[model samples]
Target: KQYIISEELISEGKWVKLEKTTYMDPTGKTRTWESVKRTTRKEQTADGVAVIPVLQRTLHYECIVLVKQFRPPMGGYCIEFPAGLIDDGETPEAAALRELEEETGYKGDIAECSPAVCMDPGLSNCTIHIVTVTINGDDAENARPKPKPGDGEFVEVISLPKNDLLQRLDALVAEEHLTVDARVYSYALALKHA
Candidate 1:
C-alpha cells in the first residue's frame, strides 16, 4: 500500500475542500495527487455510518400514495412506499411505524417485512427495512396537518384512487410525473399488489 509523504491544501471552501497529496506509487514510484470532497457532510465511512431500517407497514388505505418533496438528486418529487431510518435504540419495525405516522399520517398494521439495502456499495453503507402496511383513508387532504420536517424530512402526502395511482405511476415512468422518484415507484408496485 502507498502512504502519503506530504500534503497541502490547494483550496478550501464551504461545500468542498481540495488538497494536494503525495504518495509512493507501485514500483517505488512517487506520485502527486489532488482530491476534493464534500466538506459540509464530509465523513469517512471508515469513521462513521448511517443505518436505515427496512419495514412493511400497510397504509391506512391501500390506494393512497406517500409524497415527499423532491430531493434534487432524484429531481422534481418523490413518491415512495412508506419507510424510514431506524433511530438509535429503535428496532427496524418500530422505526417503520413511527415514520409512517410522522411522514404520511399513516397508522396501520404492517402486512410484511421486505428487507432491502442500497445497491450502491461505494457511496452508501445504508441497510434499509421496508414495511408493508394495509391502509384506508377516512380523512382527505383537508383533514390532516402537514408533516413535521426532520434532518430526515422532505415529504407531503397525495392521496388518490387506485386508478389515479396507476396513472401517475405510468406518467412517472413516461417521465411525466414524479419522475425519478423510487419511493413512488415502490408504492406503485405495492399498490398493484394491494
Candidate 2:
C-alpha cells in the first residue's frame, strides 16, 4: 500500500497552490507526486458551488440554464452550468442561488443539493457542491431575465430544452466549435438514459 510521508509547498498563486507529496510505495520506494490545490478552500466548507437551474415553463415544457464563457486556461469557450466559489461561512444553497442570479438573472429555489463532490481529483483537491434549483418561468420577474455578469465575465446565457439536452450539446460542440464541461456533459448524458 502507499501512504503519504510528507508534503512540501512548491509554489503559491492568488487562487491556487502547487505542492509535492512524498509517499512510500508498495515496493518500499519513496515517490513524490505534484498536485494543485485551491488556496481559498476553507477547512469545513466546499471550495466551490454549481447550480443546475431548471426552468419550468409548463407541465411538459422545461429547460435548463447554461452559460457559455471563455476559459483562459483552455484558451476557448466552454458551455457549463452557472457556477462560482462559495464565500466564507456561506451555505452551498446560498452560493448557488447567488451565482444563478448573477450569471443567468433568474431567481430559483433550491430543490436538492449534493454533498461535496470532486471534479479533478487527480490534479487538484478542489471540491464543489452541486445544487439543483427550480425556477418558475410563469413568474413576472422571469419574463425578461437580464444577466449581470461581473467585470471580465462575458457570459452568454442559454436555455436548452431539458429533454433534448445531450443532442443539443452535441450539435453545439460540433457546429459552434465550443467545448462542454465534463460535469455538464455527464449530467446531460445521464438524463438522456434516465
Candidate 3:
C-alpha cells in the first residue's frame, strides 16, 4: 500500500470532492496525483460503492429488465440496468433488492454477486459490484417489470428482449432515437454472443 503523505482539498461538493494527494511510491519516489473522491450516502462496505443490479426475468430468460430515462449529459434517453448507490449500512445484495423494488416495482433474488471493481481507477475512486438478480416470478403481479413512483425519478421500465436486443439497438441507432449507455451496450454484446 502506498503511504499518503499529505492531501490537499481542492474542492468539496455534496457528493464528491477533488483532492491533491501526495504519496510515496514503492521505489521511495514522492508523487502527487489529483484524484476525484466520492462519498456514499452511507458508509457501508467501502465508500463510493454503487451496485449494478443486472436484472434477469426468471420466467423469460431472453427478456432483460432495464430502465430508460433522459440523461442531461447525453441530452437524450439512455437504456441501462437497474442501478443505485449503496447506502452505508447496506450490503450490495440488500441495496440491489431495495433499488430494484424502488425503481421497478418487483422483488428479486440475488443470483450472483461479483467482487468490487473500479470503474475508473485513474480518474476516480468510484467502484461498484455487479449483481445479477432474477426477478421473482412466484406472484403473477410481479411477473412483469413495472416502474414505480419514486422521488424526482421519471424512469420507464424497459423489457429488452435479448433475442432482439441487437436488432432493436441497430434500429434505434438508424433512427437516431436514443443512445445506449456503455454498460447496457456491453450487456447487449454479452447477450448477442450468448
Give a tens-digit lDDT track for model 3, residues 130-154.
7788765556768665666568788
**Ordering by lDDT:** 2, 3, 1
Clashing pairs in 3: 42-88, 43-88, 44-88
Residue 70 of model 3, lDDT score? 82
Worst 10 residues of 3 by lDDT: 46-55
Off by over 4 Å in 1: 1-61, 136-146, 162-164, 172-177, 186-194
Candidate 3 residue 28 C-alpha distance from true site, Å: 4.1
Deviating ranges (above 4 Å) for candidate 2: 1-3, 24-29
Model-by-model lDDT, in order? 0.55, 0.91, 0.72
- Superior candidate under lDDT, 2 versus 3: 2
Each prediction's TM-score versus the true structure:
0.52, 0.93, 0.80
Model 2: which ten-residue window has the lowest total lDDT?
Answer: 37-46
